[PDB]
Structure 1
Amino acid sequence: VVGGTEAQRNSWPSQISLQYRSGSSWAHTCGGTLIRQNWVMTAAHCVDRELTFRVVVGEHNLNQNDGTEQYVGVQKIVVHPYWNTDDVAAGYDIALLRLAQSVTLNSYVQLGVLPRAGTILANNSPCYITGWGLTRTNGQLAQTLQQAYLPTVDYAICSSSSYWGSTVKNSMVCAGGDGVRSGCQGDSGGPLHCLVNGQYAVHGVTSFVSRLGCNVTRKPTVFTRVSAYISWINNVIASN
């Protein structure tokens, strides 16, 4: 997260760190959202490869003991069948991970509320992105969970040629684009929390940014639109 600040510990209890086993230890690669006691929602491009994954819930500091963490294996990876590794702009960048064990919920670990199927936010709706990603283009990971205010850019604006053009699809949510705040490497798979009728819900799964950099004006961060996959999600859950 570029342009952000360190989140407080109870603001985003649904955020998790996705990590792969690397030799002796593990390595943060992506974000994700806890949506059931034993299911996490992330981006397909994060789990495209055959590696050993775990999610950390109640994580705040990647390399210090917060006293609140549960380190949970991923047993099952379910990618959207139409995901195409080589065409992220086609969409379907979503995946669900069934955890080896169920986590225990507390003030630091909660399920993320998803929107009703088909929900489309009005333009410039207030949202926050969160994660441990780079704090500047080509920088280093944030050790502590970061948040940035990142309001939505509606499809009509985001798909105009000055923005993302035909690269954006209606199955996505764009946010930010002001050249100061955005998602960045290590944030993908994580949530976009958007404030509607007083309560937060995870409207996006961080997917992509410009090749020119993270906080590029008129290149807002692009998220898979969760509300377009609600029936797919529920049926993955119900069938496994």
Structure 2
Amino acid sequence: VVGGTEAQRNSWPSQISLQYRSGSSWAHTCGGTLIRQNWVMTAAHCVDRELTFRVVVGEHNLNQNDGTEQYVGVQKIVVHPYWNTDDVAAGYDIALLRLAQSVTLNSYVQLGVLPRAGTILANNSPCYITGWGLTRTNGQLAQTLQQAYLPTVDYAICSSSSYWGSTVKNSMVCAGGDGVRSGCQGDSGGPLHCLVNGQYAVHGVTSFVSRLGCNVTRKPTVFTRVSAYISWINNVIASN
């Protein structure tokens, strides 16, 4: 989270923390979003590793237990079939995780809403990015959940020479790029919440930034476009 502010407690009830075990504790590594009581959505690159993972729902402050959280293990993992570790710029950065138990819904824990299949946002639409990532290029991880305002940048402008050029594809969404606000290490895993008709929905999964840094002018944060994979998502789950 570069350039935002602290979110109000339990405000984005569908956000989750993804951790791996290490020594006496559990370390935060990526974020993601809850779509069923026993399914989570995240990035492929977060789970290409062979580790021991868990999921926290209802979280806010990572160093203290305040009473709203629930801890659950990861039972199974499906990565999109075209994913290639060697080329993030090729697209397909998406994954699904089946949990070892069904979580309890409540005021602090709720499901995220998905976009209709095929939808495409206009230039400059309003969205927000949520996270536990660094709060400055070369900084340190955040303690409590952060948020920042980050509007859309269309395909025609995003994929031009002064921007990202051919690195960008039609399966992706850009946002931000003013040099003030963006993504940052530890925010990988989505979500990107966008307003449509006065209602919110999850239109992106965070994916990458430029190697020069986190907040760079003309290099907006890049996300996998959810509306492009609606069929795969439903079919995987139904078949299992």
TM-score surpassing 0.5?
Answer: yes
Per the TM alignment, residue 101 of structure 1 is displaced from its structure 2 partner at its CA by 0.6
| Kept in 1: contact 2:131–2:145 (CA 8 A) | yes
Once the two structures are superposed, residues 37-91 of structure 1 have per-residue CA deviations (whole angstroms, 9 ceiling, x without a partner) of: 1111000000001111111110111111121111111111111111111100100
Once the two structures are superposed, residues 167-213 of structure 1 have per-residue CA deviations (whole angstroms, 9 ceiling, x without a partner) of: 11110111101111101100010200001111111100000000011
Per the TM alignment, residue 148 of structure 1 is displaced from its structure 2 partner at its CA by 0.5
Q: Which residue of 2 aligns with 1:16?
A: 16
Once the two structures are superposed, residues 11-59 of structure 1 have per-residue CA deviations (whole angstroms, 9 ceiling, x without a partner) of: 2100001011112211000000001111110000000011111111101
TM-score, normalised via structure 2 length: 0.98
CA RMSD across the alignment: 0.8
Secondary structure at 2:210 match in 1: coil
Cα separation, 2, equivalents of 1:66 and 1:152: 35
Cα separation, 2, equivalents of 1:160 and 1:48: 31
Cα separation, 1, equivalents of 2:223 and 2:216: 16
Once the two structures are superposed, residues 92-151 of structure 1 have per-residue CA deviations (whole angstroms, 9 ceiling, x without a partner) of: 000001111111111111111010111110011100000100000111111100000011
| Kept in 1: contact 2:130–2:192 (CA 8 A) | yes
| Kept in 1: contact 2:78–2:97 (CA 8 A) | yes
| Kept in 1: contact 2:72–2:100 (CA 8 A) | yes
| Kept in 1: contact 2:10–2:59 (CA 8 A) | no
Q: Which residue of 2 aligns with 1:98?
A: 98
Per the TM alignment, residue 157 of structure 1 is displaced from its structure 2 partner at its CA by 1.0
State how many pairs are aligned. 240
| Kept in 2: contact 1:9–1:108 (CA 8 A) | no
Secondary structure at 2:234 match in 1: helix
Unpaired runs of at least 5, structure 1: none
Per the TM alignment, residue 165 of structure 1 is displaced from its structure 2 partner at its CA by 0.7
Cα separation, 1, equivalents of 2:46 and 2:224: 13
Cα separation, 2, equivalents of 1:183 and 1:152: 14
Cα separation, 2, equivalents of 1:163 and 1:100: 43
| Kept in 1: contact 2:141–2:186 (CA 8 A) | yes
Per the TM alignment, residue 9 of structure 1 is displaced from its structure 2 partner at its CA by 1.9
Secondary structure at 1:9 match in 2: coil
Per the TM alignment, residue 6 of structure 1 is displaced from its structure 2 partner at its CA by 0.7
Cα separation, 2, equivalents of 1:62 and 1:152: 30
Identity across the alignment (%): 100
Cα separation, 2, equivalents of 1:34 and 1:9: 18
Per the TM alignment, residue 10 of structure 1 is displaced from its structure 2 partner at its CA by 3.2
Cα separation, 2, equivalents of 1:22 and 1:10: 27
Unpaired runs of at least 5, structure 2: none
| Runs of 4+ displaced beyond 3 Å | none
